[PDB]
Tab-separated table of C-alpha atoms in Angstrom:
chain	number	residue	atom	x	y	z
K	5	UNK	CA	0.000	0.000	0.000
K	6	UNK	CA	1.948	3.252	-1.206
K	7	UNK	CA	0.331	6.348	-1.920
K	8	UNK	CA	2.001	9.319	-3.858
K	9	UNK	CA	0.469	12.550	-2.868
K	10	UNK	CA	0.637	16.053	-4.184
K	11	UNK	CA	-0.138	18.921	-1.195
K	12	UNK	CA	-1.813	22.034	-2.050
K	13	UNK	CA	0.770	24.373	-0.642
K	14	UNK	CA	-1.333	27.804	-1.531
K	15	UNK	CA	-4.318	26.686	0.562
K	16	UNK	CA	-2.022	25.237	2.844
K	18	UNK	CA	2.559	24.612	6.517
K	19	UNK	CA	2.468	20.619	6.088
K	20	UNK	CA	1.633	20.112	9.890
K	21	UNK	CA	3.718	16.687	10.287
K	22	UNK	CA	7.081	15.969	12.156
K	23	UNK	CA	9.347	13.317	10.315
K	24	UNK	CA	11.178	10.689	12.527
K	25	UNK	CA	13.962	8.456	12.152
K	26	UNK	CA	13.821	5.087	13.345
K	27	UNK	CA	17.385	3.374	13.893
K	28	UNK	CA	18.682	5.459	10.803
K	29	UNK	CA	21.903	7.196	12.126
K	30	UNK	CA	23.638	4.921	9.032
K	31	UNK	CA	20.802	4.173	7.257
K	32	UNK	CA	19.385	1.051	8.342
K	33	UNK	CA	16.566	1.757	9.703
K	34	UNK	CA	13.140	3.844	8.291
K	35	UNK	CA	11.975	7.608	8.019
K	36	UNK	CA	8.089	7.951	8.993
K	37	UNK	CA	5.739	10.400	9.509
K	38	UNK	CA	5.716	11.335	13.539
K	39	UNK	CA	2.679	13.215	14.011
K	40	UNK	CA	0.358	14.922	11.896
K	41	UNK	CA	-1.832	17.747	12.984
K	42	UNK	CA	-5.029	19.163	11.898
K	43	UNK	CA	-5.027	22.687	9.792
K	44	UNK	CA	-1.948	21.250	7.653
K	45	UNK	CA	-1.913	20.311	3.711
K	46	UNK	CA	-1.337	16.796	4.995
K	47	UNK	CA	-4.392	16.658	7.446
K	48	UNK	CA	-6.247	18.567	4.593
K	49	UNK	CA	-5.416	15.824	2.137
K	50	UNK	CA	-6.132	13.180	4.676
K	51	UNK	CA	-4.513	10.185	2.567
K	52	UNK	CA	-1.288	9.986	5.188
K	53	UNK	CA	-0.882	8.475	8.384
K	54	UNK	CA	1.073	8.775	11.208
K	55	UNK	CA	3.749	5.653	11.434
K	56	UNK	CA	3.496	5.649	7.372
K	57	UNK	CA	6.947	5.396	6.003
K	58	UNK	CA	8.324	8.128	4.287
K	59	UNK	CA	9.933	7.196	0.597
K	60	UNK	CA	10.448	10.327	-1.728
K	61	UNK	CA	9.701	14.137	-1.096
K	62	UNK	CA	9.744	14.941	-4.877
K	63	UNK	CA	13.057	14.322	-6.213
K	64	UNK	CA	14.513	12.919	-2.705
K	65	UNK	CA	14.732	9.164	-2.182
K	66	UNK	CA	14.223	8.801	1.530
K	67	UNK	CA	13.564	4.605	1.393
K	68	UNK	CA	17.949	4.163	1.961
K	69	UNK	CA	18.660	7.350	3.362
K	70	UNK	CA	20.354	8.043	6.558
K	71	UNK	CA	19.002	10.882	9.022
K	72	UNK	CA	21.505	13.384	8.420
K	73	UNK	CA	21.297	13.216	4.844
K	74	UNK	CA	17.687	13.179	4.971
K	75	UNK	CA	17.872	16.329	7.287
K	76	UNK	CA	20.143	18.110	4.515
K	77	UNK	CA	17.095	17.538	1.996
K	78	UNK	CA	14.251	18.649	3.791
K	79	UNK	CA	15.936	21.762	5.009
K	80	UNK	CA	15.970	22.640	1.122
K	81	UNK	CA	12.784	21.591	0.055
K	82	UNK	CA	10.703	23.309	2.969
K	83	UNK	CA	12.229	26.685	2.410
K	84	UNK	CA	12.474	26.679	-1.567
K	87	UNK	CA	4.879	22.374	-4.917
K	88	UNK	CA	5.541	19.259	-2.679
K	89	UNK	CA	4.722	15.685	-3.876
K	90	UNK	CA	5.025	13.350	-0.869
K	91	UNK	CA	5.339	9.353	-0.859
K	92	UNK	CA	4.550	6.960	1.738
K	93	UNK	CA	4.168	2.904	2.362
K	94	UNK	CA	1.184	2.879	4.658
K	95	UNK	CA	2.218	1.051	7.541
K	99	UNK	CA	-5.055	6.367	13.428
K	100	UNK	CA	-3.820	9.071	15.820
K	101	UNK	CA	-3.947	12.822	14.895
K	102	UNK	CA	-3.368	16.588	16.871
K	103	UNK	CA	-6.837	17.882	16.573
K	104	UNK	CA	-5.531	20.863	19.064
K	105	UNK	CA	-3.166	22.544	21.311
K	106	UNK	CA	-2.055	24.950	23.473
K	107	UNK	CA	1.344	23.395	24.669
K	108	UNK	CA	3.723	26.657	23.856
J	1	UNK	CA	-24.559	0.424	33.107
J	2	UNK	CA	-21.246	1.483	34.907
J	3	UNK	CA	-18.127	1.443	32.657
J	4	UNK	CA	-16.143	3.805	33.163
J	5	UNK	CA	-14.698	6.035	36.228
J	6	UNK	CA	-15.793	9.918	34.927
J	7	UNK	CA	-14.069	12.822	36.169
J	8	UNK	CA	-15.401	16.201	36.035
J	9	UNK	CA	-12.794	19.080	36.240
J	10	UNK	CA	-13.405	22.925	36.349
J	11	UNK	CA	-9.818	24.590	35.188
J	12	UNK	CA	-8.546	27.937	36.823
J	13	UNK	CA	-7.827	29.830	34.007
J	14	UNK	CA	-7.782	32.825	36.083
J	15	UNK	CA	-4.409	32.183	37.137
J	16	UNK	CA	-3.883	30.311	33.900
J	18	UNK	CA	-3.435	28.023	28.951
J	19	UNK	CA	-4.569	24.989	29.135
J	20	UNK	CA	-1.150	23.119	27.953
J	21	UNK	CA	-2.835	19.774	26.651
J	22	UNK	CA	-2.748	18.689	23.161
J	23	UNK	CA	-6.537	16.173	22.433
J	24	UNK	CA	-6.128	14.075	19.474
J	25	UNK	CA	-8.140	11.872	17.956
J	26	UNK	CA	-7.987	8.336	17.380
J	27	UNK	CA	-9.137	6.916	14.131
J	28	UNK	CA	-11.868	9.421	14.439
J	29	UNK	CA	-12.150	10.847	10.950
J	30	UNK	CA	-15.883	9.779	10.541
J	31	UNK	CA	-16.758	10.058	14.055
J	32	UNK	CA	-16.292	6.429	14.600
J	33	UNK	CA	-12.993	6.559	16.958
J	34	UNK	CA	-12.660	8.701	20.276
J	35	UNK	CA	-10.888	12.000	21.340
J	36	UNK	CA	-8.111	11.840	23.748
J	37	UNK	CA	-6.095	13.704	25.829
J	38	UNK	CA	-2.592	13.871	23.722
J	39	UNK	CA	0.094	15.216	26.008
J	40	UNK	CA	-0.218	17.829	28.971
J	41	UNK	CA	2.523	20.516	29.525
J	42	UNK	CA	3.783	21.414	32.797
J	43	UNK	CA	2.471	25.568	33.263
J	44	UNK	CA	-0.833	25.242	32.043
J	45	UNK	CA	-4.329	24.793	33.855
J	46	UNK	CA	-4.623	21.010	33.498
J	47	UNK	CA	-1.404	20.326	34.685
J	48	UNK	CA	-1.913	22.887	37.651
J	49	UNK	CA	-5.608	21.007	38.762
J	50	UNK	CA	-3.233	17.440	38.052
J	51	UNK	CA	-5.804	15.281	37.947
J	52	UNK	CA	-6.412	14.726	33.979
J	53	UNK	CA	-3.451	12.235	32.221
J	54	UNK	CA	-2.768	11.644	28.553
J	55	UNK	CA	-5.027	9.187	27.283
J	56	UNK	CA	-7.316	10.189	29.337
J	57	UNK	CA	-10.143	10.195	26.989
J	58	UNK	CA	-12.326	13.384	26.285
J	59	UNK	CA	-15.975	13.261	26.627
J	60	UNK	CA	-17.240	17.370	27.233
J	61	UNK	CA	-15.955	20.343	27.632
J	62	UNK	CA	-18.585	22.593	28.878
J	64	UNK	CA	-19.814	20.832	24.067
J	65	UNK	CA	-20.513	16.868	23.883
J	66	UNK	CA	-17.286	15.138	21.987
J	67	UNK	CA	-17.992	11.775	22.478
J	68	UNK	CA	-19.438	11.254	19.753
J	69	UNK	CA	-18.540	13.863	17.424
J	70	UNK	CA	-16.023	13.697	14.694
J	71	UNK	CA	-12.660	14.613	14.338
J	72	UNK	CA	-13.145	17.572	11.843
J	73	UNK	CA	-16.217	18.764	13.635
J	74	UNK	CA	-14.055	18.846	17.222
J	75	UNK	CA	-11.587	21.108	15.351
J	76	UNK	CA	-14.166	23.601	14.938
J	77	UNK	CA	-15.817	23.632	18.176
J	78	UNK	CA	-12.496	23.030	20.116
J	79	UNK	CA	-11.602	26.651	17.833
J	80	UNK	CA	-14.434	28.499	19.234
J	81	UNK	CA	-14.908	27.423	22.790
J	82	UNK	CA	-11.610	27.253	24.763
J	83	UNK	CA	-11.211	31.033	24.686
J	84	UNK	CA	-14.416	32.131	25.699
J	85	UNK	CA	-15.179	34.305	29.361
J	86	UNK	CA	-15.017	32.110	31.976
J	87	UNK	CA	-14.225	28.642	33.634
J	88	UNK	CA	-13.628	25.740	31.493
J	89	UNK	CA	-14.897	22.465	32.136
J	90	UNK	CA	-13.502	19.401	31.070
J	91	UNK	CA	-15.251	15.959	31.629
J	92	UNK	CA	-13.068	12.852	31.140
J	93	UNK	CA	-13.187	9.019	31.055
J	94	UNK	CA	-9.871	7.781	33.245
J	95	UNK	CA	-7.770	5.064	30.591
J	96	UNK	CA	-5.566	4.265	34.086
J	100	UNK	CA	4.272	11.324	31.032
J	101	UNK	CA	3.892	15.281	31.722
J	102	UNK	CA	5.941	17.392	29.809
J	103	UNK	CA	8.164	19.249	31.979
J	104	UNK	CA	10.528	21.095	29.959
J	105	UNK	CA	11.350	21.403	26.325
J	106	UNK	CA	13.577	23.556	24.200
J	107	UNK	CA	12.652	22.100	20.740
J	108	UNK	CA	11.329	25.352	18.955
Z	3	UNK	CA	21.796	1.636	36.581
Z	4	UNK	CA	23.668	-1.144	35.586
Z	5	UNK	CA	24.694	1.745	32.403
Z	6	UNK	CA	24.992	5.240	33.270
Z	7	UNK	CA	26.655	7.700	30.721
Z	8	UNK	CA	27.586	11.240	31.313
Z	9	UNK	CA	28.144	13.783	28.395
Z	10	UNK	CA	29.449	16.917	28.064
Z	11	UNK	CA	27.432	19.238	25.779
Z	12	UNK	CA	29.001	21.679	23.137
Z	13	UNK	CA	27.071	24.312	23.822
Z	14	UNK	CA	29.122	26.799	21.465
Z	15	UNK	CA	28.110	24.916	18.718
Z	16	UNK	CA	24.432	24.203	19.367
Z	17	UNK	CA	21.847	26.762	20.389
Z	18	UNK	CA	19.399	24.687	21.853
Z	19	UNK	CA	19.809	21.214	23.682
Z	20	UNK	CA	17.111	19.883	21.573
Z	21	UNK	CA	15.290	17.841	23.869
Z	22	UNK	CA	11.590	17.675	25.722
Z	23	UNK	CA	11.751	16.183	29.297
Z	24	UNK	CA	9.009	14.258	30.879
Z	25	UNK	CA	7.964	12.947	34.253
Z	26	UNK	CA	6.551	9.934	34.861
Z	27	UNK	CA	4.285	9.273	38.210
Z	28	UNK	CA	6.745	11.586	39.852
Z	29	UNK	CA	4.397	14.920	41.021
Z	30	UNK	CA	6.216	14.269	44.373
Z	31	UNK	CA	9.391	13.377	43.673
Z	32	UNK	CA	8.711	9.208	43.339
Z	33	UNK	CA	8.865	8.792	39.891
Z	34	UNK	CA	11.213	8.992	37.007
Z	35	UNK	CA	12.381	11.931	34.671
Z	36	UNK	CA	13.139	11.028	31.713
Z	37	UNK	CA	14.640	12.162	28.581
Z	38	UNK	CA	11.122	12.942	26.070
Z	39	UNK	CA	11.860	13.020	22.623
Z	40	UNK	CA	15.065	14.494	20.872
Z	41	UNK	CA	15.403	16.980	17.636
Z	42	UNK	CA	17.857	17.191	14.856
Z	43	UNK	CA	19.629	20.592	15.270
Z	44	UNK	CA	20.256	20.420	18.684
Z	45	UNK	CA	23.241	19.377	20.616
Z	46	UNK	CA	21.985	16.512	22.362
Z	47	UNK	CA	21.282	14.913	18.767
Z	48	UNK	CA	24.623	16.026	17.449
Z	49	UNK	CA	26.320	14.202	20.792
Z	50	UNK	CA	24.672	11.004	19.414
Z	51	UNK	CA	24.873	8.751	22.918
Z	52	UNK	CA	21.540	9.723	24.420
Z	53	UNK	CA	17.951	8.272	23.639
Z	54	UNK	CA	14.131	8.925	24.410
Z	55	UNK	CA	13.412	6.700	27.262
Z	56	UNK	CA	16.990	7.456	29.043
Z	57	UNK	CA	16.377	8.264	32.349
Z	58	UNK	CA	17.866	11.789	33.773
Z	59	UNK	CA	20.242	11.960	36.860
Z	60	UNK	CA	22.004	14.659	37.096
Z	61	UNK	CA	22.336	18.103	34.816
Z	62	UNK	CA	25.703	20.308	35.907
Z	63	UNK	CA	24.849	20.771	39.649
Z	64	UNK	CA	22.169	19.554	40.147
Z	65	UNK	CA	20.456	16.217	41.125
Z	66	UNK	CA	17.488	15.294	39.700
Z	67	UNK	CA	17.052	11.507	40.541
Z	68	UNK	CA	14.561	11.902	43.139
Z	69	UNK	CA	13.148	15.220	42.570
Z	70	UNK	CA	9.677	16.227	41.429
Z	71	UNK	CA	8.239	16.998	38.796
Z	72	UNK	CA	7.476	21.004	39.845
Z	73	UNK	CA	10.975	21.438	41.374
Z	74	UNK	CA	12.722	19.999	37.901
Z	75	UNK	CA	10.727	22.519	36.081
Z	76	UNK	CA	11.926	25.264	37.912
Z	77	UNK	CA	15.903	24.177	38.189
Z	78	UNK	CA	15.539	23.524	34.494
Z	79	UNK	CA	14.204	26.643	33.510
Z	80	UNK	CA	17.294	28.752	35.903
Z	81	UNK	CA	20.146	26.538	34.888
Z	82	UNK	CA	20.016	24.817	31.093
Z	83	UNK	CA	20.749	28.520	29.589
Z	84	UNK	CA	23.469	29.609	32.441
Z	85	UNK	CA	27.452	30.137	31.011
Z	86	UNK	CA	29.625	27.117	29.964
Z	87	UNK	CA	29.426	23.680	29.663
Z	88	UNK	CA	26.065	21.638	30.156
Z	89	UNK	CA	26.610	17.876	31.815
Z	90	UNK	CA	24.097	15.578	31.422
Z	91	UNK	CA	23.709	12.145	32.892
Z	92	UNK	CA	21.086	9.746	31.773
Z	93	UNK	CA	20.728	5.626	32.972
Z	94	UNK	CA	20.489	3.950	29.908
Z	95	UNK	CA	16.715	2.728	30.029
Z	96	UNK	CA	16.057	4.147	27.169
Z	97	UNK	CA	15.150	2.408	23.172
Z	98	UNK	CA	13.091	2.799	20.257
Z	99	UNK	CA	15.896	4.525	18.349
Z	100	UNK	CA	13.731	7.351	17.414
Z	101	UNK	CA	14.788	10.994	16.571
Z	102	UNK	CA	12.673	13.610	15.278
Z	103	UNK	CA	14.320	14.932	12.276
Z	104	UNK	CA	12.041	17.977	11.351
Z	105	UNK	CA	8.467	19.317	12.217
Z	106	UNK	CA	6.798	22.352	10.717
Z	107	UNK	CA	3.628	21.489	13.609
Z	108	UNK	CA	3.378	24.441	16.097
């Protein structure tokens, strides 16, 4: 079960955090942490929290080590973005922690 | 019946933000439940202490047991910052946030 | 206890430590504090040897093995951002291998 998913980034902040699991070298997975509501992910509604992450547009994240992941997605989040995920259901509705 | 042990909690937000995140839990249709995410040490829940994550939310003031996830957005927008006490009712399920420097 | 690591921080480098910190059962000093999740950026991810779950002892000065909740909020808040070096030492109880590489959620 992948999706591929295209987020409407005029309407839309993506409203996710991305973890790595085990993936200081590149063993282990990237997956969506947490999603919260108000985001283009929430708004698109197709991705899940503990999905795994596998491209950002032109990034493969599927063998990618954390560091090298957190190169890419410093440069795609502050420069349209297509998102693609294995799924594999919790989500922030609201808060007021500062 | 009798299923679950209900707490009913009015918050001081006299001297106090609530500092709780509620999420829902495959909820989307209105089919799931709405919890108590994480609470934040500072804020009115943490203050009264007796509400704990995973606590799960049935009123404030507004019934959510029932009610969907994108239709608790909504209501959760409009009613925590209106006059007065706030009143959060809670079904017990059986870590507080004490400090954090993560922007 | 049977692993307990102490590291020194490079606070020059990194800005921010990076970290939440959580209590568990401990509003009167009974529980454990523990080390909440941990962000890319920040020093504590940079040092590499801590993990969520690790359980916090000490910080510089100041013991925090048997303190409460309420009193490690305060000593946190007057003592993470003072001059030099920050020392942290965590009991290896910690796992999961998780670290939170970015988040655009406020």
């Amino acid at each position: 079960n992948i999706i591929t998913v295209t987020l409407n980034m005029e309407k839309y902040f993506l409203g996710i955090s991305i973890v790595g699991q085990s993936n200081e070298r590149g063993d282990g997975g990237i997956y969506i942490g947490s999603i919260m509501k108000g985001g283009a992910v929430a708004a698109d509604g197709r991705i899940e929290p503990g999905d795994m992450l596998l491209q950002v547009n032109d990034m493969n994240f599927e063998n990618m080590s954390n560091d090298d992941a957190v190169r890419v997605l410093r440069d795609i989040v502050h420069k349209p973005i297509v998102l693609t995920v294995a799924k594999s259901g919790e989500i922030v509705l609201w808060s007021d922690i500062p």
